[PDB]
Amino acid sequence: EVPTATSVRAIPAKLMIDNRVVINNHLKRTRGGKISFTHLLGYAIVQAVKKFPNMNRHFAVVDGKPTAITPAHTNLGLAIVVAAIKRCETMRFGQFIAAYEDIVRRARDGKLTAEDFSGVTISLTNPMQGQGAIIGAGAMEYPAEFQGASEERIADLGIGKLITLTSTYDHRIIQGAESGDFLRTIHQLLLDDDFFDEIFRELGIPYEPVRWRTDNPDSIEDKNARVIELIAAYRNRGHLMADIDPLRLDNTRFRSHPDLDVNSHGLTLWDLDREFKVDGFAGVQRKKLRDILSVLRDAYCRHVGVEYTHILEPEQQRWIQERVETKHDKPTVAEQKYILSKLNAAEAFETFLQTKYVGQKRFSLEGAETVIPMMDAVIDQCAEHGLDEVVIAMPHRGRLNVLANIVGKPYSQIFSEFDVKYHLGATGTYIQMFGDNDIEVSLTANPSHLEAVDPVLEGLVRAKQDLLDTGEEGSDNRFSVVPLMLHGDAAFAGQGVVAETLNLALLRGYRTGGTIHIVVNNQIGFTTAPTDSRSSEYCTDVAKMIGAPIFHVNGDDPEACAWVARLAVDFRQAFKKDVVIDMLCYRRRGHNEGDDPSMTQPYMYDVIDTKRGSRKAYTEALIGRGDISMKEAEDALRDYQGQLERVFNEVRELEKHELATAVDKAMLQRIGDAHLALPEGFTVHPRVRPVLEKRREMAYEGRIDWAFAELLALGSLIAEGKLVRLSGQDTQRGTFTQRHAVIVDRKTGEEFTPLQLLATNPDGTPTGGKFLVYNSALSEFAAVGFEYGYSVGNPDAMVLWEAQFGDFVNGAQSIIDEFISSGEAKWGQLSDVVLLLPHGHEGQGPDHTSGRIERFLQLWAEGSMTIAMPSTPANYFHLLRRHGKDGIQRPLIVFTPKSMLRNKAAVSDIRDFTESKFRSVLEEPMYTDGEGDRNKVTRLLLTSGKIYYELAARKAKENREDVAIVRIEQLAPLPRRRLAETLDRYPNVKEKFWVQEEPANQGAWPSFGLTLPEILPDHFTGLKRISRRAMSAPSSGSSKVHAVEQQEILDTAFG
Amino acid sequence: VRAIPAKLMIDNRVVINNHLKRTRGGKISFTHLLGYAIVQTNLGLAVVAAIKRCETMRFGQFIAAYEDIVRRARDGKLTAEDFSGVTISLTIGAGAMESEERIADLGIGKLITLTSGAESGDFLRTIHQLLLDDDFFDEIFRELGIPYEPVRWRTDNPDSIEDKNARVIELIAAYRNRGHLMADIDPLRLDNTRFRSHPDLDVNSHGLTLWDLDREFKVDGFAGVQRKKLRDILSVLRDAYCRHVGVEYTHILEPEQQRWIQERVETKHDKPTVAEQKYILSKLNAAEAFETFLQTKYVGQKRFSLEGAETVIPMMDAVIDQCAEHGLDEVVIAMPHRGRLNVLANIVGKPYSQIFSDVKYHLGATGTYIQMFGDNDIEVSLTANPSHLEAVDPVLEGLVRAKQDLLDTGEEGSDNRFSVVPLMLHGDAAFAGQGVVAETLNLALLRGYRTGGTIHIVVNNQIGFTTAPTDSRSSEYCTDVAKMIGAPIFHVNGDDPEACAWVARLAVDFRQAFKKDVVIDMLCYRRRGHNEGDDPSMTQPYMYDVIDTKRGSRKAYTEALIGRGDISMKEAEDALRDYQGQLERVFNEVRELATAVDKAMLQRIGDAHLALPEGFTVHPRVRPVLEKRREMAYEGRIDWAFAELLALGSLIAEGKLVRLSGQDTQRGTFTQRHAVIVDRKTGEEFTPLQLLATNPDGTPTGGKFLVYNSALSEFAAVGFEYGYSVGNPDAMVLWEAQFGDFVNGAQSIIDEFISSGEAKWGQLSDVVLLLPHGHEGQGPDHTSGRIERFLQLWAEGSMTIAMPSTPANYFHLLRRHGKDGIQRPLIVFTPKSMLRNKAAVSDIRDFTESKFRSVLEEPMYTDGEGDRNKVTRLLLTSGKIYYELAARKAKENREDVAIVRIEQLAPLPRRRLAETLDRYPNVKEKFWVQEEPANQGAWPSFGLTLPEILPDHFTGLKRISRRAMSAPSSGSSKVHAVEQQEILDTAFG
Ligand SMILES: [Ca+2]
Ligand SMILES: [Ca+2]
Ligand SMILES: [Mg+2]
Ligand SMILES: [Mg+2]
């Protein structure tokens, strides 16, 4: 009928085979689907028809005359009977395979119409009127004489397989020279760089296709060296080219890496089946370059970027390498349906939050909902290790979602009177889905000050660990309480408390055996772009400081996110070291209500408007991969709607409804004798020995100094079964060489803690007490935060933090302002933390003088904190004992001495410790013990602290019976009743003065000057002030000035 | 006769002499090794002189005795006693060691033949056994102070060259990545285990032996893959990564930077010239003499001794010299107190007369540095700082950035030289523990904060007062935080001043090449206690037993120069003579002792908002704002946001530099500023106020608008801006809080620098802190800038504290600030919802015919027809609450109530206030009205000071506020609303 002729061509299929492997490897790992050789051959024909429109024509007799007809389109016929893919000439690869699979998913489903069989112009068959040519495709074969040759002879010799293409053409309208060029052009296309560049583009494959190049003539040994160079480059910096960004904002990311490029390493497609020696665990092993490269891609350049070759410990690097480079089994369909059920719950909660309430756009997890399945994997993996509890600290973003879907709190409890709910703590229990374990989950309170909670969490976890006898101060080394700390990308990079907290990771006094860090990196900080937020590649680069492994993961891949979360928990359990997970995601909405984020970030938000949610993309991925059926997916949408329904239904229902501190002589003597009950063969430093000896003397003979009075209070608490945690900068010895809580053996360096002996009763039995004394790192913010957190974690522990000088505590202002002074009023979170602040005007300058009493007195409100400035060692002793034993959890701020530690007048009698209590107001001993007349007094000086001793000395020298000195030991809360009882004893006073060392604008005057004549107007109306002049600094810089100012105060007081 | 393999002998001698040439000096002969082996009792040495009592000699003593006999044969001073008393002798004969490339591969070594019956043949066998013995070469090395493991006599690995080459390449990577973990960087050598601990760096655990040393291996590089001898490979690796310099660089993500370091560190360095060594030693002499003087002539000056860290002086000298070599303009130094006066004398170059005439450890200085060998000059300056360690780090950065911008260098300059260099010193404990370090390091490459690289020197004395490094950091080095910005780290032996100078110059070269920070960890020690009376052996007895055996850097360096044969004994005597002279002159020198603008200006700033670049696409929500601004500039009703840009714009137009920055400051936290507008289609930025930097005639005004979005930090950002105003006193510098509630994260900068720098150091700053403040029901962290705290820090003329209630009063406040010729910080409590209040708007005449009013009256009494005589109750207030009290007064129509605003809280406008109150003669009660709790806002201050400062007006002043609270406000909006109505009701009750 059609006089036909044939033209045959043997085409190399090596690039075709190789790129199909890359394409289907990708699809398998991503959204699913399988590209056939027919897809590639069919599309090539359609492109070759563009260079040769005559191969598309067909013979006809139109008006008795032989004619060649130019059809309107390229309608490629395919043997399925031949069905037509219409209008192929205006199709991109993606459109063509969609059209190809449309006809195919209808031949199988029996939904093909007569229209699908008409109008074919060219066709393809896989072993004629109205069509000019039929292209035939043979099976992939080796050239004759190479059939039966070893798979390694084929590899060594560089022999590839061949497709024989045939072209049966109408010789009335097509020339044999043209037909041959058509096949030569399909040959060229199926070896062409740009051809495979488009196929990859159109399938979303970010990797460079396998390239048709000439086989490198170098030896296997020389190439092997380059393979090993390439393995090291992926391991070290493969993370720089990983497909971690769900938005793919930076196109350039997947190129211009000569270090990871196979082609710039003298390797070609011809080496893919060649075997190369690679060193590892089982020693040297021979592997196919193809396998080497696919493992490297899967491990370092897909949805997970691994940073680990910065870790100085080789064992840890091998550990990560082994787990990340092994062929790890795909999750079970039950495991995938579980991850999807979590995404359903996360997305339903988010949808509800933004629908049912206004002003919730700032807490939106929309674009970051994978954090919920990720956090679930973390907590489940901790339960798998049989751990006790997971304590979470996080900012406001997604917090109520974490309460519902992670802490497991009911909607009735979360939304009762729906804000402060984004700052309060919670406790729940997590039950394993597949496993048989349960774990406690708790969330800690936090302010709006980003990252400020980081050290608080650590302190709180450490207190729980110590109680559970786990970790550092525990019999086991499990650290069965896990810190899970969330962060945002901008705050993690810019806030210093992060480096300060990371620095505590492995310290004896602060370690919690590793923290799991999750950074919700939405690549934005309110209005700010990452280039204005950090001077480094990743927001997590600060974690490299402690050599922590960093995992950058694609927030659109909840399988990779869960896998990484579990790996993180396993590393932490293995090395007791912090792990950071950088979850790359996006913020779908504006920062707050009304905000149009395209005002400042138009590019990012044009891209975000084209993004479908994690849940819909994950469901589609599962379908396309053949992991779930359409029915299984319909059930998933049914589950999402059910979740969305019960959250609306549950909140709808709720809206329809809604004191003796004295000790015995035996106790004093026991604490004193402990200082000499040295271990066998212990060599005390010759300068330390007189101190131990003076302490035994003091405990028996009196004249107790401040430093010993402190150890007497702490020692007696330990003896009574209390945990005592003391720490600060150089706190083991004391800044002023006064504590000696820990004494070092002069010859061996062995440490001895005398107060630890009090943890054992005289009969040998433990008391239950403990003395935990540490030298802190050189930080104020993290240390103060840690101790605050510790008291919250263990309310029965006596927790003390000591400033080197009270002048440096301003470095912890966020903690004081946001947690210590206000946590009870704001969150109902109680703390019994003690801040020891060395204070006193001694002529050492503006940074060695003041603890800023005036600032604490300003933060104070009825029952928030206790503020005291004791003038005697025994009053300090009773203050600490009262604090530890009152059953009240309220912070105590103490203004402690420096030179008054060695003042021989500031000493206490044994009866002051055994027959007294804390005195909030103190009188001169001459009126309470001696033979002094209070009626002779006409001038009353009210003071606090060390200046009492100078005013007392002056009164004694001049012998002034008309002047009395009254001390306010407890500055806040004011001892109104005790102060009134005292002043009533001086009936002939004609003038009262508040006397202080500090500038007029500092100390207690700004407070007392205003409140004392208000609180007690019958006693203090007309109260005058004697102080230093108001200053913009805590003191003068000159010692000589200080001395003149100090004498001015005493002269005025007695003038 | 006996033929012996002397391969281990040759190999270890190469290692021995390679070590000695670099360190202490001297050359070990084969005769030293053979002679000592024989001994293992007087050994005769051939003309045959004896070494007596060899049996009680260690290797070092034997070589000393051996060379003591050589210095008697050469010097002709041998006595008869030196020839009488011998036991055994050596000349025992000794034969010479006999293709050069074909022999290396077969594993054949050189043979040495020995001579002299059975016990004689056994003695040559005991000699044989010793030259291939571990413990022998182990003790020889320990005696010569060599910290490395000797070459071992092991059996040749039977594996192929290709297989070994792979293990060689693994080993090269191991040294490059982790070799620093094995470097001789500790002058005290406290950790013995250091040179054994690593199988990763061990040649023997890599299937390589001494038999592979002369075997060639293929190694890739810059000029391509080249064949090198394993011994050459290993010696280069050791010299580069395991001697006195530990290099950390493989963590750097930029390859061109890693190659750069690799090339400079792995090339064969030429030894310094004797002039260069005598110069380094002259600097150590000056440093040690100054220290000796300081501890002799003064007591209490032990707190800041550099004793054990004096190499920091030659190191810092190399840094500054290298900056002068690059022809840079200035080096600005920030450092703690340790060694500060030494830096003043020997680095800043201040005379002893100026230094010694304490506060001196906190004040700034300026000097000029002149090159020794070079022909250049460079300015050297030191900045003021508190005792708060590391807090100056951001201040230095801000101060360098201000100087760079003035010099038209770097980021806001025509050149990319960054000709002003930050040189920041630190201590090991503070660098690791203080967060402001990470916050400052984070600014390194930001557009708004970059200074083109900071040189960091960490004076690492391996102690932090009484605290040991294990209690101070959770990482290997105190410098590990620098890895955050991918900065190269160099760990250097403080006892080797040549390596310290070399590293300093390399650091300056890297910084100039990549405009990125470089950290030098100088390992040293603290010879004395932390301060005075301190016996450091109470807490660190081990470290201090070791330190008591250490001879100083100067004696150590002079002895090494002698040993190496770099200087003669006379040249060393001159060096002690120089030290003595330096010590003498230091003792001898000290012994001798209108804001209004015109309509044209307003209109120009307004028109600028629409003078868009050609083809610019404004966001549709931004366009109405630009249009309203042109309208406001011509028609009035000027809002707060525009009033601010009117003040800044007019300053730029008058030739002033204006630097504005904070979190999301380009747009504004409340979408109100729009200082920078982003092109909807291209992302291109447009800054309308920059147009004002050019006069109508086209000429530049000299002004500039530098507006930035800060990083998410308060401490570093506030510090940076404080520093900026100090570096450029003629610049208008503003820092904006997101909410005034977050500025407490910058408390150290407020307390130590801003509020007190003038009183303490004489250091003036004109910095402006913008703190969004107000009770609006948003919670305790979105309400207060803590007015009460600033008012407490204030003392006559330290700062200005204001809370303006109108856009024009804010405008005049900023203009007064920028134009008063006074350098004093300004704290402004700015609005949030009052930005959009239609009543809080200003008229054009308020900008053109007025000035800043510190005290404001109700417009009805100053413009309207209101009677002040009708008033019996006076309400004193400040800020937004005025509008609610005014609305309430208007509603109820209350002529008997007057509202007076205190716009300037500090310093109190005593005269303006009295003048005003005197106009209300029938007032029967005065109240201070505030939104804040009783213990906060201005009441704690005003309640005490107003009845003191003006007793005839304010005795009897009562308060109307919220109750005292432990937080700035309630957490509930509903509570806030009830409390807010309570205030208004009480005020009008
Ligand atoms: Ca308590
Ligand atoms: Ca000014
Ligand atoms: Mg973010
Ligand atoms: Mg130190």
Would the CB atoms of A225 and B169 count as touching at under 8 Å? yes
A989 touches chain B (CB under 8 A): no
* Binding-site annotation: residue ranges of B for 2-oxoglutarate: 362, 387, 782
What DSSP assignment string belongs to A567-580? HHHHHHHHH---EE
B309 touches chain A (CB under 8 A): no
Identify the residue among B256, B445, B471, B754 best suited for mutation to test binding to A, counting A beta carbons within 10 A and taking the highest.
B471
Question: Which residues on B lie below 8 Å from A506 (Cβ)?
Answer: 474-475
Stretch (H or E) spanning A533: helix A530-533
Distance CA B350, CA B366 (A): 8
Would the CB atoms of A526 and B434 count as touching at under 8 Å? no
Instruction: Specify the CATH number of the domain A659-919.
Output: 3.40.50.12470
Instruction: Identify the CA nearest to A809 among candidates A773, A772, A842, A838.
Output: A838
Instruction: Identify the CA nearest to A736 among candidates A904, A898, A876.
Output: A898
Direct distance between the N- and C-terminal alpha carbons of chain B, in angstroms, rounded to an integer: 123
Strand partners, A288: A275
Distance CA A1012, CA A807 (A): 27
B69 touches chain A (CB under 8 A): no
Class of domain B854-989: alpha beta
From B670, which residue of chain A is nearest by alpha-carbon distance? A595
Residue B353: how many other CB atoms lie within 10 Å: 11
A107 touches chain B (CB under 8 A): no
Distance CA A799, CA A794 (A): 9
- What is the least distance, in Å, from the CA of A235 to any CA of chain B? 12
A264 touches chain B (CB under 8 A): no
B583 touches chain A (CB under 8 A): no
Question: Any long-range contacts for B628-632 (C-beta under 8 Å, 24+ apart)?
Answer: B630/B606, B631/B606, B632/B606
Which ligand has an atom closest to residue A601 CA?
3
Residue B670's φ and ψ, nearest 5 degrees, are -105, 30
Two tokens at B902?
A: 């205190």
A68 touches chain B (CB under 8 A): no
Question: Which residues on B lie below 8 Å from A594 (Cβ)?
Answer: 671
Question: Which residues on A lie below 8 Å from B534 (Cβ)?
Answer: 737
- Within the 850-889 window of chain A, which residues sit less than 8 Å (CB to CB) from chain B? 854-855, 858-862, 864-865
Dist. CA A948 → ligand 1 center (Å): 27
Domain layout of chain A by residue ranges: 1-302, 303-658, 659-919, 920-1055
Distance CA B200, CA B171 (A): 7
- What is the least distance, in Å, from the CA of B829 to any CA of chain A? 19
Would the CB atoms of B542 and A999 count as touching at under 8 Å? no
B469 touches chain A (CB under 8 A): no
Classify residue A247 by its DSSP letter.
T
Residue A474's alpha-carbon distances to A463, A464, A467, A468, A478, in angstroms, are 11, 11, 9, 7, 9
Would the CB atoms of B253 and A240 count as touching at under 8 Å? yes
- Given 3.30.230.10, 3.40.50.970, 1.10.10.200, 3.30.70.260, which CATH number is that of B244-594? 3.40.50.970
Would the CB atoms of B966 and A825 count as touching at under 8 Å? yes
Residues 6+ apart with CB under 8 A from B97: B6, B10, B110, B111, B112
Distance CA B752, CA B388 (A): 8
- Residue type at position B344: L
Contact between B589 and B351 under an 8 Å Cβ cutoff? The reply is yes
Classify residue A248 by its DSSP letter.
-
Distance CA B357, CA B361 (A): 13
Stretch (H or E) spanning A1024: strand A1024-1028
CA angle, A293 as apex, A288 and A295 as ends, to 5°? 95
Stretch (H or E) spanning B873: strand B873-877
- Residue type at position A952: A
Instruction: Specify the CATH number of the domain A303-658.
Output: 3.40.50.970
Contact between A374 and A558 under an 8 Å Cβ cutoff? The reply is yes
Two tokens at A473?
A: 């101060």
Classify residue B611 by its DSSP letter.
-
Class of domain A920-1055: alpha beta
Distance CA B528, CA B523 (A): 16
Question: Which residues on B lie below 8 Å from A259 (Cβ)?
Answer: 255
Residue B270's alpha-carbon distances to B26, B258, B494, B509, B565, in angstroms, are 19, 22, 20, 17, 16
Would the CB atoms of A596 and B467 count as touching at under 8 Å? no
Residues 6+ apart with CB under 8 A from B361: B304, B337, B340, B341
Two tokens at A264?
A: 């710039």
Distance CA B216, CA B230 (A): 6
Question: Which residues on A lie below 8 Å from B473 (Cβ)?
Answer: 503, 507, 777
Sign of dihedral through CA atoms A820, A824, A828, A831? Answer: positive
Rg (alpha carbons) of chain B, rounded to whole number = 37
Distance CA B527, CA B529 (A): 7
Instruction: Specify the CATH number of the domain B595-853.
Output: 3.40.50.12470
What DSSP assignment string belongs to B239-301? HHHTSSEEEE-TT-S-HHHHHHHHHHHHS-PPPPPHHHHHHHHHHHHHHHHHHHHHHHH-SST
Contact between A504 and A455 under an 8 Å Cβ cutoff? The reply is yes
Residues 6+ apart with CB under 8 A from A59: A2, A66, A67, A68, A69, A132, A170, A172, A173
Size of interface A-B (CB pairs under 8 A): 354
Dist. CA A367 → ligand 3 center (Å): 11
Two tokens at B654?
A: 């008058």
Judge whether A977 is annotated as a binding position. Answer: yes
Two tokens at A509?
A: 């006094």
Instruction: Identify the CA nearest to B221 among candidates B253, B254, B248, B258.
Output: B258
Direct distance between the N- and C-terminal alpha carbons of chain A, in angstroms, rounded to an integer: 135
Classify residue B759 as exposed, middle or buried by CB count within 10 Å of its CB (0-12, 13-18, 19+). Answer: middle
- Residue type at position A69: I
Dist. CA B462 → ligand 4 center (Å): 5
Identify the residue among B167, B170, B178, B484 best suited for mutation to test binding to A, counting A beta carbons within 10 A and taking the highest.
B484
Which ligand has an atom closest to residue B800 CA?
2
Residues 6+ apart with CB under 8 A from B712: A450, A490, A491, A493, A494, A495, A525, A528, A533, B663
Residues 6+ apart with CB under 8 A from A157: A146, A149
What DSSP assignment string belongs to A898-957? SGGGS-SSS-B-HHHHHS----SEE--HHHHTS---STT--EEEEE-STHHHHHHHHHHH
Pairing mode, strands B925-933 and B958-962: parallel
Contact between B708 and A533 under an 8 Å Cβ cutoff? The reply is no
Of these residues, A26, A58, A73, A171, which one is catalytic?
A171
Would the CB atoms of B433 and A860 count as touching at under 8 Å? no
Classify residue A613 by its DSSP letter.
P
A396 is catalytic: no
Dist. CA A780 → ligand 4 center (Å): 17
Instruction: Identify the CA nearest to A376 among candidates A562, A554, A560, A522.
Output: A562
CA angle, A654 as apex, A376 and B777 as ends, to 5°? 85
Question: Which residues on B lie below 8 Å from A999 (Cβ)?
Answer: 795
B780 touches chain A (CB under 8 A): yes
Same fold, B244-594 and B595-853: yes
A615 touches chain B (CB under 8 A): no
B388 touches chain A (CB under 8 A): yes
Identify the residue among A600, A683, A688 best suited for mutation to test binding to B, counting B beta carbons within 10 A and taking the highest.
A600
What DSSP assignment string belongs to B529-588? -SSSS--GGGT-HHHHHHHTTPPPHHHHHHHHHHHHTSS-HHHHHHHHHHHHHHHHHHHH
Q: Please name the method used to determine this structure.
A: X-ray
Would the CB atoms of B792 and A854 count as touching at under 8 Å? yes
What DSSP assignment string belongs to B111-127? EEEE---HHHHHHHHHH
Task: Say which of A531, A599, A858 has its CB closest to residue B619.
Answer: A599
Strand partners, B660: B707, B734
Instruction: Identify the CA nearest to B705 among candidates B663, B754, B666, B664.
Output: B666
Measure CA B161 to chain center. Answer: 48
Instruction: Identify the CA nearest to A788 among candidates A893, A870, A716.
Output: A893
Distance CA B500, CA B317 (A): 10
Pairing mode, strands B518-523 and B455-460: parallel
